Symmetry: C2
Amino acid sequence: RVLKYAILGLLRKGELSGYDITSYFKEELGQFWSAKHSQIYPELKKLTDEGFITFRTKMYTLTDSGKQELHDWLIRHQPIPETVKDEFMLKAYFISSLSRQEASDLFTDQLLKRKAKLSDLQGSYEKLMAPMSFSSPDFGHYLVLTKALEREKNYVSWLESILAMID
Amino acid sequence: RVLKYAILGLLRKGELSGYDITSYFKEELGQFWSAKHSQIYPELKKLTDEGFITFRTKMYTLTDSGKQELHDWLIRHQPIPETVKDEFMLKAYFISSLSRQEASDLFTDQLLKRKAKLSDLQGSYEKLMAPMSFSSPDFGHYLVLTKALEREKNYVSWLESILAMID
């Protein structure tokens, strides 16, 4: 039920259609929480049968039960997950099988793609910021944007310093 | 076949038993590439039927075919994946449903756990470094250690600066 709390959360500010919920997944949310389109409507239906959302004629809204379910999940302290899979880093672990030139080529290609990804994130940041506060309506978007930005900058920085060792 | 290239890579320096391959997963590799124990021996068997590894009496070794298969995968340029799921960041996106105090409590608990995780990584780093070079036999381990270190430092740093905004 990977989509349960994503959908409950998307509804936290009022009603949305199933189209709208899908677009929120295909846009700013499905960067850090991707959904298969084949899973949205089963989850919507399951949340309905569970009494967490209701609908009108189709526009879904949180029920009070759904609001409470969302709230309990938000404040819950969870163990931090096991490291997220990174296929490139599996390669890095096995670097003894690469020549110096092949490792340089591999890391350089990775650096290029992550700087390019960083560039897209810096664009979305300047678009969003075109004075942030806790209760600002965009604070949540600002949180995921800056986390992703910081993450790519650090990845870029690590790649550059390994390239400086390799080369 | 999530384990295919992890196992081929574990064998790149010579023969290993299935026990040894499992321990490499339960130790330094299964941090950034976890395996279910129920998947190791099916993968070993599949790689055997594929001619990528062979065995003696059970000690598995790469075949020349397996070495080539590993090599082709290493040098291949792949698209960088969609962002890795982070449940905490889904919460951060939905922060408008939290009071200031609840968000502070949530972020503070996250900061504590990631600093503690950073501490374990800094210990493994000082243990490993008890003068790194490209062809050093530990370079691969040094790559995954420093990537994970840099990653937790940046996460800690981002959490601290959000806490400085929230509080």
